[PDB]
Design a protein around this ligand. Sequence first.
Ligand SMILES: [Mg+2]
Ligand SMILES: [Mg+2]
Ligand SMILES: [Mg+2]
Ligand SMILES: [Mg+2]
Ligand SMILES: [Mg+2]
Ligand SMILES: [Mg+2]
Ligand SMILES: [Mg+2]
Ligand SMILES: [Mg+2]
Ligand SMILES: [Mg+2]
Ligand SMILES: [Mg+2]
Ligand SMILES: [Mg+2]
Ligand SMILES: [Mg+2]
Ligand SMILES: [Mg+2]
Ligand SMILES: [Mg+2]
Ligand SMILES: [Mg+2]
Ligand SMILES: [Mg+2]
Ligand SMILES: [Mg+2]
Ligand SMILES: [Mg+2]
Ligand SMILES: [Mg+2]
Ligand SMILES: [Mg+2]
Ligand SMILES: [Mg+2]
Ligand SMILES: [Mg+2]
Ligand SMILES: [Mg+2]
Ligand SMILES: [Mg+2]
Ligand SMILES: [Mg+2]
Ligand SMILES: [Mg+2]
Ligand SMILES: [Mg+2]
Ligand SMILES: [Mg+2]
Ligand SMILES: [Mg+2]
Ligand SMILES: [Mg+2]
Ligand SMILES: [Mg+2]
Ligand SMILES: [Mg+2]
Ligand SMILES: [Mg+2]
Ligand SMILES: [Mg+2]
Ligand SMILES: [Mg+2]
Ligand SMILES: [Mg+2]
Ligand SMILES: [Mg+2]
Ligand SMILES: [Mg+2]
Ligand SMILES: [Mg+2]
Ligand SMILES: [Mg+2]
Ligand SMILES: [Mg+2]
Ligand SMILES: [Mg+2]
Ligand SMILES: [Mg+2]
Ligand SMILES: [Mg+2]
Ligand SMILES: [Mg+2]
Ligand SMILES: [Mg+2]
Ligand SMILES: [Mg+2]
Ligand SMILES: [Mg+2]
Ligand SMILES: [Mg+2]
Ligand SMILES: [Mg+2]
Ligand SMILES: [Mg+2]
Ligand SMILES: [Mg+2]
Ligand SMILES: [Mg+2]
Ligand SMILES: [Mg+2]
Ligand SMILES: [Mg+2]
Ligand SMILES: [Mg+2]
Ligand SMILES: [Mg+2]
Ligand SMILES: [Mg+2]
Ligand SMILES: [Mg+2]
Ligand SMILES: [Mg+2]
Ligand SMILES: [Mg+2]
Ligand SMILES: [Mg+2]
Ligand SMILES: [Mg+2]
Ligand SMILES: [Mg+2]
Ligand SMILES: [Mg+2]
Ligand SMILES: [Mg+2]
Ligand SMILES: [Mg+2]
Ligand SMILES: [Mg+2]
Ligand SMILES: [Mg+2]
Ligand SMILES: [Mg+2]
Ligand SMILES: [Mg+2]
Ligand SMILES: [Mg+2]
Ligand SMILES: [Mg+2]
Ligand SMILES: [Mg+2]
Ligand SMILES: [Mg+2]
Ligand SMILES: [Mg+2]
Ligand SMILES: [Mg+2]
Ligand SMILES: [Mg+2]
Ligand SMILES: [Mg+2]
Ligand SMILES: [Mg+2]
Ligand SMILES: [Mg+2]
Ligand SMILES: [Mg+2]
Ligand SMILES: [Mg+2]
Ligand SMILES: [Mg+2]
Ligand SMILES: [Mg+2]
Ligand SMILES: [Mg+2]
Ligand SMILES: [Mg+2]
Ligand SMILES: [Mg+2]
Ligand SMILES: [Mg+2]
Ligand SMILES: [Mg+2]
Ligand SMILES: [Mg+2]
Ligand SMILES: [Mg+2]
Ligand SMILES: [Mg+2]
Ligand SMILES: [Mg+2]
Ligand SMILES: [Mg+2]
Ligand SMILES: [Mg+2]
Ligand SMILES: [Mg+2]
Ligand SMILES: [Mg+2]
Ligand SMILES: [Mg+2]
Ligand SMILES: [Mg+2]
Ligand SMILES: [Mg+2]
Ligand SMILES: [Mg+2]
Ligand SMILES: [Mg+2]
Ligand SMILES: [Mg+2]
Ligand SMILES: [Mg+2]
Ligand SMILES: [Mg+2]
Ligand SMILES: [Mg+2]
Ligand SMILES: [Mg+2]
Ligand SMILES: [Mg+2]
Ligand SMILES: [Mg+2]
Ligand SMILES: [Mg+2]
Ligand SMILES: [Mg+2]
Ligand SMILES: [Mg+2]
Ligand SMILES: [Mg+2]
Ligand SMILES: [Mg+2]
Ligand SMILES: [Mg+2]
Ligand SMILES: [Mg+2]
Ligand SMILES: [Mg+2]
Ligand SMILES: [Mg+2]
Lengths: 114, 155, 70
Amino acid sequence: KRQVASGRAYIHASYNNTIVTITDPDGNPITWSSGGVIGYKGSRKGTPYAAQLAALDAAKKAMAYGMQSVDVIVRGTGAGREQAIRALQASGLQVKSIVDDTPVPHNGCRPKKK
Amino acid sequence: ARRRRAEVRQLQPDLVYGDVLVTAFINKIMRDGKKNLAARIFYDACKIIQEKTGQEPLKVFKQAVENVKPRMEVRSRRVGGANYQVPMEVSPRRQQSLALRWLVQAANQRPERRAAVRIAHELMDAAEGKGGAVKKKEDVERMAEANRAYAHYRW
Amino acid sequence: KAKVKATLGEFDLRDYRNVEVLKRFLSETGKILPRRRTGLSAKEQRILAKTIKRARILGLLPFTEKLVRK
RNA sequence: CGCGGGGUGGAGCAGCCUGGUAGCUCGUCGGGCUCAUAACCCGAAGGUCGUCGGUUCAAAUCCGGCCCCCGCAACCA
RNA sequence: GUGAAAUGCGCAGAUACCGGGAGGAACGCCGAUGGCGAAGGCAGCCACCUGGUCCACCCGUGACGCUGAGGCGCGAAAGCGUGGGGAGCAAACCGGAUUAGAUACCCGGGUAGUCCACGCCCUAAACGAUGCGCGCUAGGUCUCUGGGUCUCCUGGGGGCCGAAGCUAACGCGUUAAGCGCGCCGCCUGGGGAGUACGGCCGCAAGGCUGAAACUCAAAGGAAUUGACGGGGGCCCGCACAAGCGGUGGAG
Ligand SMILES: [Mg+2]
Ligand SMILES: [Mg+2]
Ligand SMILES: [Mg+2]
Ligand SMILES: [Mg+2]
Ligand SMILES: [Mg+2]
Ligand SMILES: [Mg+2]
Ligand SMILES: [Mg+2]
Ligand SMILES: [Mg+2]
Ligand SMILES: [Mg+2]
Ligand SMILES: [Mg+2]
Ligand SMILES: [Mg+2]
Ligand SMILES: [Mg+2]
Ligand SMILES: [Mg+2]
Ligand SMILES: [Mg+2]
Ligand SMILES: [Mg+2]
Ligand SMILES: [Mg+2]
Ligand SMILES: [Mg+2]
Ligand SMILES: [Mg+2]
Ligand SMILES: [Mg+2]
Ligand SMILES: [Mg+2]
Ligand SMILES: [Mg+2]
Ligand SMILES: [Mg+2]
Ligand SMILES: [Mg+2]
Ligand SMILES: [Mg+2]
Ligand SMILES: [Mg+2]
Ligand SMILES: [Mg+2]
Ligand SMILES: [Mg+2]
Ligand SMILES: [Mg+2]
Ligand SMILES: [Mg+2]
Ligand SMILES: [Mg+2]
Ligand SMILES: [Mg+2]
Ligand SMILES: [Mg+2]
Ligand SMILES: [Mg+2]
Ligand SMILES: [Mg+2]
Ligand SMILES: [Mg+2]
Ligand SMILES: [Mg+2]
Ligand SMILES: [Mg+2]
Ligand SMILES: [Mg+2]
Ligand SMILES: [Mg+2]
Ligand SMILES: [Mg+2]
Ligand SMILES: [Mg+2]
Ligand SMILES: [Mg+2]
Ligand SMILES: [Mg+2]
Ligand SMILES: [Mg+2]
Ligand SMILES: [Mg+2]
Ligand SMILES: [Mg+2]
Ligand SMILES: [Mg+2]
Ligand SMILES: [Mg+2]
Ligand SMILES: [Mg+2]
Ligand SMILES: [Mg+2]
Ligand SMILES: [Mg+2]
Ligand SMILES: [Mg+2]
Ligand SMILES: [Mg+2]
Ligand SMILES: [Mg+2]
Ligand SMILES: [Mg+2]
Ligand SMILES: [Mg+2]
Ligand SMILES: [Mg+2]
Ligand SMILES: [Mg+2]
Ligand SMILES: [Mg+2]
Ligand SMILES: [Mg+2]
Ligand SMILES: [Mg+2]
Ligand SMILES: [Mg+2]
Ligand SMILES: [Mg+2]
Ligand SMILES: [Mg+2]
Ligand SMILES: [Mg+2]
Ligand SMILES: [Mg+2]
Ligand SMILES: [Mg+2]
Ligand SMILES: [Mg+2]
Ligand SMILES: [Mg+2]
Ligand SMILES: [Mg+2]
Ligand SMILES: [Mg+2]
Ligand SMILES: [Mg+2]
Ligand SMILES: [Mg+2]
Ligand SMILES: [Mg+2]
Ligand SMILES: [Mg+2]
Ligand SMILES: [Mg+2]
Ligand SMILES: [Mg+2]
Ligand SMILES: [Mg+2]
Ligand SMILES: [Mg+2]
Ligand SMILES: [Mg+2]
Ligand SMILES: [Mg+2]
Ligand SMILES: [Mg+2]
Ligand SMILES: [Mg+2]
Ligand SMILES: [Mg+2]
Ligand SMILES: [Mg+2]
Ligand SMILES: [Mg+2]
Ligand SMILES: [Mg+2]
Ligand SMILES: [Mg+2]
Ligand SMILES: [Mg+2]
Ligand SMILES: [Mg+2]
Ligand SMILES: [Mg+2]
Ligand SMILES: [Mg+2]
Ligand SMILES: [Mg+2]
Ligand SMILES: [Mg+2]
Ligand SMILES: [Mg+2]
Ligand SMILES: [Mg+2]
Ligand SMILES: [Mg+2]
Ligand SMILES: [Mg+2]
Ligand SMILES: [Mg+2]
Ligand SMILES: [Mg+2]
Ligand SMILES: [Mg+2]
Ligand SMILES: [Mg+2]
Ligand SMILES: [Mg+2]
Ligand SMILES: [Mg+2]
Ligand SMILES: [Mg+2]
Ligand SMILES: [Mg+2]
Ligand SMILES: [Mg+2]
Ligand SMILES: [Mg+2]
Ligand SMILES: [Mg+2]
Ligand SMILES: [Mg+2]
Ligand SMILES: [Mg+2]
Ligand SMILES: [Mg+2]
Ligand SMILES: [Mg+2]
Ligand SMILES: [Mg+2]
Ligand SMILES: [Mg+2]
Ligand SMILES: [Mg+2]
Ligand SMILES: [Mg+2]
Ligand SMILES: [Mg+2]
Ligand SMILES: [Mg+2]
């Protein structure tokens, strides 16, 4: 919420954008970022380079709150998933452990027209 | 170039400095096969280089041409149906040919009357890292980064 | 690599309680492991699947393990 | 009639906070890409930041009067 | 969110993350070249009720068999009636985009419906486009499921390859489209037409039975060759790209 060294980062990989939410080890967010926050609009928010800058920026912001250690959690498939991850550990942030939690139904709700 | 790959044409060194770079640079100045005139205008400037600064025109040329070497450019790869302007490497071949071309192109852009007086100034400001030829370089490099997103298409 | 059938000793596969036995079949992520790698035959593969499902319902077995470190 | 907050580039607007930043958007010009058209990208020209005075080393920023607009409330023999 | 966008949503605090709660629908992995059913169809798990089917033992009846007009029952989806349910999706509908237009393909919204009960509707590319039963005519391999001391033997299904043979060809070939017999249904040029009339059924939508006038000299199946494609593979040309110089402007 305000001051903790350990924590966790959340990758969210859409196909038209990528966001990242760093939170305390409880769940409550500290800060976040995304392709749009970075500067891009539309398709480019999907770009892997944007995703790179998102994780980077989200990291820098967390760095200030005293963040140093984070377990990464990813959901999505967008071209930027691993790039957010790669950009995370390379951000001097401690990547304790990357995890995949991308939801998927055991057959329930009918999808869109696609 | 669908077949082979084309041999990068070879070139007889300078009849003075013994530099192939200068030989090539002359050709860019050359108008309508009049190679003689071109060399003339060049060397006239070459001496003018020293007339202004105690430095010899040798490294003035290298220093200049090296500051107009664009590190990376934007090539438009028309894949995915759309034409994306991807930023990527500049072949060592291009960096030279482009530099020299921009050099002379920007030189001709200068206002001053005599042609050799332009090659001199443009060459000086270039090594000084200030010339208008450098301006095209600073551009192509920025134009490359203003699109670093799509760089994930780098082939 | 290593068939899951031989990897274990003699065992009943209608037993929906010897989690230690069953747990070995249940993938890295709780997914009922493919027959083409459990070494099981048609009839046995079926009875297994049914008992696993039973266990999961009793809470003994998982429905989904998260993919760790990737 | 009293009270309230506005004037900044060709147009809309942040900055006013609390003094050292005039920015953004589209628009105009050149360039890049384009079947075309936008989208995207590069660069560029353009603002006494209403007026006149005042404190200040330095304000469009704080002050006084005023011009004009917008709004609030009231009155109308 | 898309090709890119826009409509839309968001400082009245959205997206992303965590916790608690509500509700409907559908059942991941197992899952398949799989299984069951007469067909339509049937997938989480449990229990109950119930149909069909296959194997063994050689036990029982003694031709009691086959087909089957009409009848009767079943019959995906959509649709209809009464009442209930409503998360997601989504005809109609509204908006955005694209375009010459775009009553569409894409996007943002969204109702009936999709779900349940009872009752109608009765159609389909209800397709193996192949009626049911029986007997007879090489094998190779793959798999599902029964029985037997079991590198195998023997029944019952599910695919492929293929004897003979059949076929206009494509192809079928013990799961026949081969060789035969019984029985039912159906066809007789294309269009007009599954239309009209009559009848029968239905709440309605509509369904069943089902012509003629007129008109055409073809409609049609399979296969051959080539041409073509906003099909693919390999390969090439100043075809693009890279680069230099030009016409289009002026006389
Ligand atoms: Mg974009
Ligand atoms: Mg996109
Ligand atoms: Mg939709
Ligand atoms: Mg080649
Ligand atoms: Mg195109
Ligand atoms: Mg070269
Ligand atoms: Mg699996
Ligand atoms: Mg008054
Ligand atoms: Mg008054
Ligand atoms: Mg007054
Ligand atoms: Mg007030
Ligand atoms: Mg200043
Ligand atoms: Mg800017
Ligand atoms: Mg203008
Ligand atoms: Mg336009
Ligand atoms: Mg823009
Ligand atoms: Mg001034
Ligand atoms: Mg001033
Ligand atoms: Mg003044
Ligand atoms: Mg008003
Ligand atoms: Mg007031
Ligand atoms: Mg008054
Ligand atoms: Mg009045
Ligand atoms: Mg646009
Ligand atoms: Mg919306
Ligand atoms: Mg606010
Ligand atoms: Mg929850
Ligand atoms: Mg929740
Ligand atoms: Mg609660
Ligand atoms: Mg509800
Ligand atoms: Mg629930
Ligand atoms: Mg319910
Ligand atoms: Mg269901
Ligand atoms: Mg499956
Ligand atoms: Mg498989
Ligand atoms: Mg099947
Ligand atoms: Mg069924
Ligand atoms: Mg059922
Ligand atoms: Mg019962
Ligand atoms: Mg039964
Ligand atoms: Mg039975
Ligand atoms: Mg006997
Ligand atoms: Mg007997
Ligand atoms: Mg007996
Ligand atoms: Mg007898
Ligand atoms: Mg007897
Ligand atoms: Mg008979
Ligand atoms: Mg009879
Ligand atoms: Mg009849
Ligand atoms: Mg009958
Ligand atoms: Mg009935
Ligand atoms: Mg159904
Ligand atoms: Mg229905
Ligand atoms: Mg319906
Ligand atoms: Mg009514
Ligand atoms: Mg109803
Ligand atoms: Mg209910
Ligand atoms: Mg209702
Ligand atoms: Mg609903
Ligand atoms: Mg919807
Ligand atoms: Mg409406
Ligand atoms: Mg509108
Ligand atoms: Mg519309
Ligand atoms: Mg058109
Ligand atoms: Mg119109
Ligand atoms: Mg409409
Ligand atoms: Mg609705
Ligand atoms: Mg209706
Ligand atoms: Mg249901
Ligand atoms: Mg119910
Ligand atoms: Mg009910
Ligand atoms: Mg009735
Ligand atoms: Mg029905
Ligand atoms: Mg019929
Ligand atoms: Mg079929
Ligand atoms: Mg048959
Ligand atoms: Mg038959
Ligand atoms: Mg044999
Ligand atoms: Mg084999
Ligand atoms: Mg067997
Ligand atoms: Mg024996
Ligand atoms: Mg069958
Ligand atoms: Mg089958
Ligand atoms: Mg067989
Ligand atoms: Mg033959
Ligand atoms: Mg033949
Ligand atoms: Mg065959
Ligand atoms: Mg045989
Ligand atoms: Mg036989
Ligand atoms: Mg056979
Ligand atoms: Mg025959
Ligand atoms: Mg006729
Ligand atoms: Mg006819
Ligand atoms: Mg006829
Ligand atoms: Mg009929
Ligand atoms: Mg009819
Ligand atoms: Mg009909
Ligand atoms: Mg009649
Ligand atoms: Mg009738
Ligand atoms: Mg009738
Ligand atoms: Mg009736
Ligand atoms: Mg009826
Ligand atoms: Mg009646
Ligand atoms: Mg009724
Ligand atoms: Mg009605
Ligand atoms: Mg009628
Ligand atoms: Mg007749
Ligand atoms: Mg007829
Ligand atoms: Mg003819
Ligand atoms: Mg044909
Ligand atoms: Mg033939
Ligand atoms: Mg053709
Ligand atoms: Mg392909
Ligand atoms: Mg090729
Ligand atoms: Mg060219
Ligand atoms: Mg011309
Ligand atoms: Mg000419
Ligand atoms: Mg001409
Ligand atoms: Mg012309």
